Amino acid sequence: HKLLVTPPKALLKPLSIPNQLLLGPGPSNLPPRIMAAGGLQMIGHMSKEMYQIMDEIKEGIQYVFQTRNPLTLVISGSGHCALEAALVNVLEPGDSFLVGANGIWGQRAVDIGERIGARVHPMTKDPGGHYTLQEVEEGLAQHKPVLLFLTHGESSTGVLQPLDGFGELCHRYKCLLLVDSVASLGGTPLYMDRQGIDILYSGSQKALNAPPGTSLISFSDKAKKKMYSRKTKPFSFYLDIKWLANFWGCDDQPRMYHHTIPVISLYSLRESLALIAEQGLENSWRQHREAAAYLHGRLQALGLQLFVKDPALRLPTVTTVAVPAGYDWRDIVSYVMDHFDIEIMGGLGPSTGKVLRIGLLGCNATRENVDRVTEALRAALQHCP
Amino acid sequence: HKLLVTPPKALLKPLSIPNQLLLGPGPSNLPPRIMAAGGLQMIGHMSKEMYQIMDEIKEGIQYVFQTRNPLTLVISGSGHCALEAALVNVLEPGDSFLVGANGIWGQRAVDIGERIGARVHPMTKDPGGHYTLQEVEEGLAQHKPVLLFLTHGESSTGVLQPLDGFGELCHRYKCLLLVDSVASLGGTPLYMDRQGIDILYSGSQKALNAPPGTSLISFSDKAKKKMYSRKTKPFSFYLDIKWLANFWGCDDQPRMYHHTIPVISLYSLRESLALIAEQGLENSWRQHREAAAYLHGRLQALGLQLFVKDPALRLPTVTTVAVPAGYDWRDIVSYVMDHFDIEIMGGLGPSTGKVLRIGLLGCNATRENVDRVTEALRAALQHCP
Ligand SMILES: *Cc1c(COP(=O)(O)O)cnc(C)c1O
Ligand SMILES: *Cc1c(COP(=O)(O)O)cnc(C)c1O
C-alpha cells in the first residue's frame, strides 16, 4: 500500500530555461508566431476543425514541395521517422535499394535499409562528395534497384547536391527517387514534380523554424502504386502509409482513427507554413543564398577555411568550416556558448572532429546572426588555447 | 524556372481555433501551466540544460510509474509508438507473444506483433471482459510465451483490469509482463515494481493533460537483459532502444545523437509531471475515483445505463455508457458538440456503435464537467430524435 518513489524535488521547482542563440544545424530559434500557437489550447484530435487545419497543412506541404501529389502528409515524428516511414513502406524485404552514402544521412538510410531486410548498395563517397550524375547512372544501372536515396542538403558535410534529371533518369530505369530535403527545404531551390522526385521528405525544425518532432512527406503516384500493391506488410504499424494516408484525407474513405496526431505541434507547423507562404519560396531561397554568401565572406576573413571547396556545392542552410589547426575544436564550441550564449556545432558521423557547422535557418538566416557568430568565433580564436 | 503551386490562400488567414470542452477519452484540455511552457523558446537539443530537463522528466516517469528501473525514458511518439517500441525491441521474429485482446488496444498489440513476425496468441474476450487470473495462468502455461501484453485501463471498453500477481506469476514462467497504462496512469493505482511489471508504457495526452505526441516507457532489468542480448536487430532504427537508452542517459556511455527530441513537447511533459508530483499520486487517484463515481450517479439518473456491470471494474478515467435504444448515437454526440461545445466520443474497435465514452482526465476530472456533460446529455436526450 506504500509508495516506493517520492515526488522528485527537481520537479517542484519551476521550469526555467536559458536564453540561447541557436546557430547550429538545427533545431533553430522560433519566431513569435510559432511560439504563440505553441501556447494554444487543445481541440479534438478528430474535430472537423482539426481536419481543416490538417488540410491547410497539406496544401502548405504541397506549396513548399511544389507538388500536387495527393499522397502528401505529416509524419508524427522527427526527420528520421519520415525517412524510416519512406523506407518501411517502399522496401519489401528483398527489394534492391541504392544509397548515396555522402554523409551521415546516407548512412542512416543504409542502417534502416539493412534493418528492414533490403539489398542496400552503399555508394560510399568521402565527406564532401556530391554524387556525379555520372556515378549515379552507373550505380543504378549496375544494381537495378527499385529505390534510390539521395540527400539534397547534406547537413553533415555542408554539401548541396544537384538533383536535376535524376528523376527523369530513375524513371527510365523504372526506379523511384527518394530525396532527403530536411536541411534544404525552404533554403535552396527544389521542385518535387518538375524534378520528378518520387518520395520527398523534410523535417519541421530546420528552415521552417517549427519545433522538432514532426516531419513532412509526399509520394508520387508511382510510389503510391508500389506501396498499395506490396505483398508484404510493413514492419511498422505506426508508420503504415495505408493507415496514415486515410486519416490524413488522402483516400476515398472517411478518416479512421489510427494514432493521435500531435495537435499542438500541428498548430505550430501550420503557422510555419503560413509564414513561408507569405514570404514566398523564391524570396526565402534568396535570403538563404545572400546570408550564406555573407557568412562565407566573414569566415574567410577570420583566417578560417570553408570545408567545401566549390561554392556552387555549398549548402546555404548549413555551413561547414574546417577546424583551425592548433585548436581543440571543442573549446571553440564551448567558448562560443560560454561567452556569447550562442550554439554552434561540430562534426557528425564522417565529418566528426574534422569540421564546425554553422546553420542559417528561416527567420534566423540573417546578416546580424552572421555578425554575432563571426564576432563570437573571432574572440574564441583569440583566447581558445 | 516557374512555380507550379501558388501559396495557399487558407494559409494566408490567421490561425483560429474553436473553444471546446474535451470530455472524451483524450486528448484532454490543457491547464495554464502546460499551455505556457508550450509557448516557450527553443534551447539546444543537446545543451546541458536540455539534458537536465530530460533527467527531471526521467525522475518524473519513475515517480508516476513507481519504479527505479534505470531504463526509463520518453518515446518521441504517440501512445502507439511506445507500444510499438516495446514490441519491436522485445520480440524477435519467432518469439512467442500472448495478448489479452480485451479491446482495440489488445488488437493493435496483435497487429504490431504479427507485423514484426511473432507467434502471437489472441486471448479474445468480448468488449467488457477483464481477463481472469484464471484465464491467464492457463493461456501462458499453454503457449510458453516470452511476452504477455495486458491493457490496464481499457479506454475502448471502459474496463479497469486487475494487475496484482500477474507479475509474480509471469516471472515464475520466465515470462516478462507488458502493461499499457496510457489511460490508467495518474487516474487509478499502479505500481510498476511492486507489481513486478516488466514493460510499462503510458502516453502524454490522457490523465497527465500534456499535448499528444510523446509517450512514457520503462523496462525492468529482465527486459533490459532480453533486449541487449537479442540476436536479431529491431526492424526499426527510430525506436531502437539501444540508441534511445544512450541518448536518454541510461548508459555508461556519453549521449550520442540519435534523433532530435521534441524539445518543446518535453517542456510541456516536464510540467505535467511537475503538476502530478505536487498534487501527489494518491490524491490524484482519489480525485479520479470520486469524479467517476459522481459521473456514474448522474448518468444512471438520466435513465442511462453504465456499460460495465461491475463497478470495481470501471475505469475511472474513461466511462462507457450503453447506447440509449431508439437513438442514433451519432446525433447525441453531434448535439453535445453542436449545442454545448463539448466533445464526447463513441465506440472504438469492438465497442463501435455499442457505446458512448466519457473521459475524466487530470485537471479535467471535476464535478463541474460531470455537471456540464450531464446537463448536455440530458438536453440531447430531450430533442435528439
Ligand atoms: C536535421 C536533419 C534531419 C532530421 O533529423 P531528426 O533529428 O530526425 O529530425 C534529417 N536529415 C537531414 C539531412 C538533416 O539535416
Ligand atoms: C489514448 C490511449 C493510447 C494512446 O494512443 P495514441 O493515440 O497512440 O496516443 C494507448 N492506449 C490506450 C489504452 C489509450 O486509451
From Swiss-Prot, chains A, B:
It is found in: Peroxisome. GO terms for molecular function: alanine-glyoxylate transaminase activity; amino acid binding; identical protein binding; L-serine-pyruvate transaminase activity; protein homodimerization activity; pyridoxal phosphate binding; transaminase activity. Changing S184F: In HP1; loss of alanine--glyoxylate aminotransferase activity; loss of dimerization but improved dimerization in the presence of pyridoxal phosphate; decreased protein stability. Changing S155L: In HP1; loss of alanine--glyoxylate aminotransferase activity. One of its GO terms (cellular component) is peroxisome. The keyword Methyltransferase does not apply. Coiled coil: none annotated. It is an enzyme of class 2 (transferase). Substrate binds at R357. It catalyses: L-serine + pyruvate = 3-hydroxypyruvate + L-alanine; glyoxylate + L-alanine = glycine + pyruvate. PROSITE patterns: AA_TRANSFER_CLASS_5 (PS00595). Changing S215L: In HP1; loss of alanine--glyoxylate aminotransferase activity; loss of dimerization; no effect on protein stability. Changing P8L: In allele minor; associated in cis with M-337; decreased specific alanine--glyoxylate aminotransferase activity in vitro. Alanine--glyoxylate aminotransferase activity is inhibited by 1 mM (aminooxy)acetic acid by 97.5%. Its EC number is 2.6.1.44, 2.6.1.51. Changing G158R: In HP1; loss of alanine--glyoxylate aminotransferase activity; reduced expression levels; decreased protein stability; protein aggregation seen in the cytosol with a decreased aggregation propensity in the presence of pyridoxal phosphate; loss of dimerization. Keywords: Acetylation, Aminotransferase, Disease variant, Peroxisome, Phosphoprotein, Pyridoxal phosphate, Transferase. The modification N6-succinyllysine is found at K222. The modification N6-acetyllysine is found at K222, K231, K309. Its cofactor is pyridoxal 5'-phosphate. Liver. Peroxisomal aminotransferase that catalyzes the transamination of glyoxylate to glycine and contributes to the glyoxylate detoxification. Also catalyzes the transamination between L-serine and pyruvate and contributes to gluconeogenesis from the L-serine metabolism. Belongs to the class-V pyridoxal-phosphate-dependent aminotransferase family. Homodimer. It is linked to Hyperoxaluria primary 1: An inborn error of glyoxylate metabolism characterized by increased excretion of oxalate and glycolate, and progressive tissue accumulation of insoluble calcium oxalate. Affected individuals are at risk for nephrolithiasis, nephrocalcinosis and early onset end-stage renal disease. This is Alanine--glyoxylate aminotransferase. It comes from Homo sapiens. The gene is AGXT.
